[PDB]
Curated annotation (Swiss-Prot), chain B:
The chain holds residues 981 to 1029 of 1224 of the full protein. Coiled coil: none annotated. The gene is RPB2. It comes from the Eukaryota. Component of the RNA polymerase II (Pol II) complex consisting of 12 subunits. Belongs to the RNA polymerase beta chain family. This is DNA-directed RNA polymerase II subunit RPB2. It is found in: Nucleus. The binding of ribonucleoside triphosphate to the RNA polymerase II transcribing complex probably involves a two-step mechanism. The initial binding seems to occur at the entry (E) site and involves a magnesium ion coordinated by three conserved aspartate residues of the two largest RNA Pol II subunits. Present with 18700 molecules/cell in log phase SD medium. DNA-dependent RNA polymerase catalyzes the transcription of DNA into RNA using the four ribonucleoside triphosphates as substrates. Second largest component of RNA polymerases II which synthesizes mRNA precursors and many functional non-coding RNAs. Proposed to contribute to the polymerase catalytic activity and forms the polymerase active center together with the largest subunit. Pol II is the central component of the basal RNA polymerase II transcription machinery.
From Swiss-Prot, chain C:
The gene is DST1. A zinc finger (TFIIS-type) spans 19-59. Zn(2+) binds at residues 23, 26, 51, 54. This is Transcription elongation factor S-II. It is found in: Nucleus. Belongs to the TFS-II family. The lineage of its organism: Eukaryota, Fungi, Dikarya, Ascomycota, Saccharomycotina. Necessary for efficient RNA polymerase II transcription elongation past template-encoded arresting sites. The arresting sites in DNA have the property of trapping a certain fraction of elongating RNA polymerases that pass through, resulting in locked ternary complexes. Cleavage of the nascent transcript by S-II allows the resumption of elongation from the new 3'-terminus. It comes from Saccharomyces cerevisiae (strain ATCC 204508 / S288c) (Baker's yeast). S-II binds to RNA-polymerase II in the absence of transcription.
Swiss-Prot record, chain D:
Zn(2+) 1 binds at residues 7, 10, 29, 32. Belongs to the archaeal RpoM/eukaryotic RPA12/RPB9/RPC11 RNA polymerase family. PANTHER family: DNA-DIRECTED RNA POLYMERASE, DNA-DIRECTED RNA POLYMERASE II SUBUNIT RPB9. The keyword Repeat does not apply. One of its GO terms (cellular component) is RNA polymerase II, core complex. Transmembrane segments: none annotated. This is DNA-directed RNA polymerase II subunit RPB9. Keywords: DNA damage, DNA repair, DNA-directed RNA polymerase, Metal-binding, Nucleus, Phosphoprotein, Transcription, Zinc, Zinc-finger. A zinc finger (TFIIS-type) spans 71-111.
Curated annotation (Swiss-Prot), chain F:
It comes from the Eukaryota. The chain holds residues 771 to 855 of 1733 of the full protein. Residues 40-52 are annotated as: Bridging helix. Coiled coil: none annotated. Mutagenesis experiments demonstrate that the minimum viable CTD contains eight consensus Y-S-P-T-S-P-[A-S-N-G] heptapeptide repeats. Identical and simultaneous substitutions in a number of consecutive repeats are lethal: 'Ser-2' -> 'Ala-2' (14 repeats), 'Ser-5' -> 'Ala-5' (15 repeats), '2-Ser-Pro-Thr-Ser-5'-> '2-Ala-Pro-Thr-Ala-5' (10 repeats), 'Ser-2'-> 'Glu-2' (15 repeats), 'Ser-5' -> 'Glu-5' (12 repeats), '2-Ser-Pro-3' -> '2-Pro-Ser-3' (15 repeats) and 'Tyr-1' -> 'Phe-1' (12 repeats). The tandem 7 residues repeats in the C-terminal domain (CTD) can be highly phosphorylated. The phosphorylation activates Pol II. Phosphorylation occurs mainly at residues 'Ser-2' and 'Ser-5' of the heptapeptide repeat. The phosphorylated form of Pol II appears to carry, on average, one phosphate per repeat. The phosphorylation state is believed to result from the balanced action of site-specific CTD kinases and phosphatases, and a 'CTD code' that specifies the position of Pol II within the transcription cycle has been proposed. This is DNA-directed RNA polymerase II subunit RPB1.
Length: 86, 49, 61, 116, 35, 85
């Protein structure tokens, strides 16, 4: 914004042109490359923390009056699309 | 391995000249890292030593 | 009537109060904690901190 | 509180029956000719929720159990200061933590809750 | 001579045991048990 | 299992206690330190606490493995094309 530029940054003309060019250049290099296998990337990303999720699943086990399914069994039930939840 | 669940592998071997020494000319038969003590809380290793 | 109105309430999960961790959302140090041996015993205990002022949650291990 | 009544002939429980011409209730045994006259219109009872005060259960020779704790509270009857104390021996989920004391000498039962 | 006794995991439900011998008379933190 | 050391025997936790005992030292409280030393009963309770996590790892390794395989097999054939779809 104009007030932010002139009052907070105090950029000159050269620095302003440099910032605009750098912003455009760094944006144009962030698009995704055609050919990427995103399915296996997504599956690995979701299922790697699922391996470590077991350890801290039973923290809600520390509250006896909060016997609500969450963690490994809840993810299992979500994936199976079970028709009878606990 | 030691008797407190602290096991490892040999990573390099040095000769008596490159070994740090005390004022009495004693040399350690082996050297381990101290980054293994806190998270394992093996105070019995230190007491045994 | 008063007893029924009292008995219609839910379980209040009051957590331990402490003033050491700094929250990342509202930065109010009234952040509750809970710590346990849950990760593999090859590594130390795991703590989970939840801000009671805004609802932020995080983990330290 | 309905009580089972057995026939005096063959010890079988008596079933109810009505007398229309006199309009009176009787108990008859389906195996023999015995008939007895009902004393009350109360024959059966079905309660739903039990408003029973918690009971210490068996008390006989409870002072010889060596895994039972002790206390120095004073007996309200025989003025003795040695007794056994334990929690309610009925295993309901919602039972309160109200103690029960059995005196060593007079075998008197009392509780730590002195509600008037 | 009746100086020791063999106890299984069932009779143990009806006994009392003093762990140290000195606990039977009337660093770390050792508590005096009320029994 | 998220609770203090329950009554394994009838109305106690260890043969050295008395029936209907609810004191902290009798229900699994360790007031010592690793530098001081643990007394036998709190040592036993600590052993059970550790056993829980050991079991946790040893089995949920396999369960998580199965879930991971099913996930990767389900999604293995998805690709960004030149239409950007």
């Amino acid at each position: 914004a104009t007030r932010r530029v002139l009052q907070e940054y105090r950029l000159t003309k050269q620095a302003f042109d440099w910032v605009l060019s750098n912003i455009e250049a760094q944006f144009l290099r962030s698009v995704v490359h055609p050919g990427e296998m995103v399915g296996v990337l997504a599956a690995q990303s979701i299922g790697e923390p699922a391996t470590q999720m077991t350890l801290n699943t039973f923290h809600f086990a520390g509250v006896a009056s909060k016997k609500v399914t969450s963690g490994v069994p809840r993810l299992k039930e979500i994936l199976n699309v079970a028709k009878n939840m606990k | 391995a030691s008797r407190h669940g602290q096991k490892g592998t040999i990573g390099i071997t040095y000769r008596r000249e490159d070994m740090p020494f005390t004022a009495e000319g004693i040399v350690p038969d082996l050297i381990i890292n101290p980054h293994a003590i806190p998270s394992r809380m093996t105070v019995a290793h230190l007491i045994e030593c | 009537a008063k007893q029924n109105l009292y008995n219609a309430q839910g379980a209040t999960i009051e957590r331990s109060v402490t003033d050491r961790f700094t929250c990342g959302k509202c930065k109010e140090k009234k952040v509750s904690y809970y710590q346990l041996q849950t990760r593999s015993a090859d590594e130390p205990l795991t703590t989970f901190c939840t801000c009671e002022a805004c609802g932020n949650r995080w983990k330290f291990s | 509180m309905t009580t089972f009544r057995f026939c005096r002939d063959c010890n079988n429980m008596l079933y109810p029956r009505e007398d229309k011409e006199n309009n009176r209730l009787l108990f008859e045994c389906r195996t023999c000719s015995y008939v007895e006259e009902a004393g009350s219109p109360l024959v059966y009872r079905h309660e739903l929720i039990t408003n029973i005060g918690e009971t210490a259960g068996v008390v006989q020779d409870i002072g010889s159990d060596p895994t039972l704790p002790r206390s120095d509270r004073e007996c309200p009857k025989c003025h003795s200061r040695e007794n056994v104390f334990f929690q309610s021996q009925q295993r309901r989920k919602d039972t309160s933590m109200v103690l029960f004391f059995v005196c060593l000498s007079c075998s008197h039962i009392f509780t730590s809750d002195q509600k008037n | 001579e009746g100086l020791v006794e063999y106890i299984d995991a069932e009779e143990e439900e009806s006994i009392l045991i003093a762990m140290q011998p000195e606990d039977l008379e009337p660093k770390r933190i050792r508590v005096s048990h009320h029994a | 299992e998220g609770k203090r050391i329950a009554f394994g025997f009838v109305d106690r936790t260890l043969p050295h206690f008395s029936k209907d005992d609810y004191s902290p030292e009798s229900k699994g409280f360790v007031e010592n330190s690793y530098l001081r030393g643990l007394t036998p009963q709190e040592f036993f309770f600590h052993a059970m606490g550790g056993r829980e996590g050991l079991i946790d790892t040893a089995v949920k390794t396999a369960e998580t493995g199965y879930i991971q395989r099913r996930l990767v097999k389900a999604l293995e054939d998805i690709m960004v094309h030149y239409d950007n779809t």
